Amino acid sequence: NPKAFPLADAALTQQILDVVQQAANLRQLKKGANEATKTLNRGISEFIIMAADCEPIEILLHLPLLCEDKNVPYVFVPSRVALGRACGVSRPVIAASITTNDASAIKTQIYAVKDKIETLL
């Protein structure tokens, strides 16, 4: 019913933020709504993490539309302050994208969170 949906719980959010941080160190993370949008167009995204406290929320609502057309899982986290900190940058982040790489060192972790997001949807 709310525009930002599904919203991950406290337990799920930490695991998402964990994977985001590891992907950042491995250069497997695309930060920002614009960069996330490009990944969806290129079909190189594992899943999209969005911040549900974006002010206004509408400036990232095109991503769910692109995700559902492309069958890419997506999930909302409560805070953009927390998402930006996990992303590794010094500024809040409203959207981020995990880049597809079957030869990554964090493959198992990504698919674990990817499955739970799919269950959430």
Binding site: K3, N34, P56, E58, I59, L60, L61, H62
Partner: protein, 35 residues
């Protein structure tokens, strides 16, 4: 060159303004004004 930077800056803000309008049932002008 300075003219191009304003054009790029305005294009980014125009993109966000379109998002607020499209994905809002009853869009307001409050955010466009501050933008």
């Amino acid at each position: 060159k300075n003219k191009g930077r304003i054009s790029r800056y305005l294009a980014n803000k125009c993109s966000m303004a379109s998002r607020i309008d499209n994905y809002s049932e009853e869009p307001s002008n409050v955010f466009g004004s501050v933008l």
